Design a protein around this ligand. Structure first.
Ligand SMILES: Nc1nc2c([nH]c(=O)n2[C@H]2C[C@H](O)[C@@H](COP(=O)(O)OP(=O)(O)OP(=O)(O)O)O2)c(=O)[nH]1
Length: 156
């Protein structure tokens, strides 16, 4: 009986590494994140994901593939986040730091889970195995999960 707002999250996943972005400023700074943000009026979810990737990382790609959907709920916030998660298939430039985000590559045996949002530990492994998923996580603040669900699915 809550409303949701649409967000995207994009993982540039290559065979041996993944690109993540360090939030540099404001509340939440200091954590490594996928690239993403609010979907804007009119644009498709995929086009919103492509735009956020360009804005936050500098990479321009023609196409993404959707791998999952995750709902976030925060204690004290009545609006849910409806997060559509995408991976890149191919990229063709270099990442660039903004004043808001610093991109960095991590080898896939060095995924920095302790410095990522806590839910990422649950769904990232499915993403790495090329599986699709649906998830829901309820947070007290930034660090504490009170309830969550995660299910591999055949169709997002
Ligand atoms: N639980 C969880 N929350 C995340 C992840 N990544 C992520 O940005 N968030 C949270 C932090 C923020 O509350 C929200 C992101 O919203 P935002 O306002 O930063 O998005 P945005 O950059 O489009 O905002 P704006 O600059 O356009 O105002 O989602 C994640 O992987 N897991």
């Amino acid at each position: 009986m809550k409303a949701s707002r649409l967000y995207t999250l994009v993982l540039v996943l290559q065979p041996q590494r993944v690109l993540l972005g360090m939030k540099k400023r404001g509340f939440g700074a200091g954590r490594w994140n996928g690239f993403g943000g609010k979907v804007q009026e009119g644009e498709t979810i995929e086009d919103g994901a492509r735009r956020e990737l360009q804005e936050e990382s500098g990479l321009t790609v023609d196409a993404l593939h959707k791998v999952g959907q995750i709902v976030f709920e925060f204690v004290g916030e009545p609006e849910l986040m409806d997060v559509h998660v995408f991976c890149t298939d191919s990229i063709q430039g270099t990442p660039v730091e903004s004043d808001e985000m610093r991109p960095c590559w991590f080898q896939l045996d060095q995924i920095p889970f302790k410095d990522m949002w806590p839910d990422n530990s649950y769904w990232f492994p499915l993403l790495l195995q090329k599986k699709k998923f649906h998830g829901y996580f309820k947070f007290q603040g930034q660090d504490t999960i009170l309830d969550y669900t995660l299910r591999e699915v055949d169709t997002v």
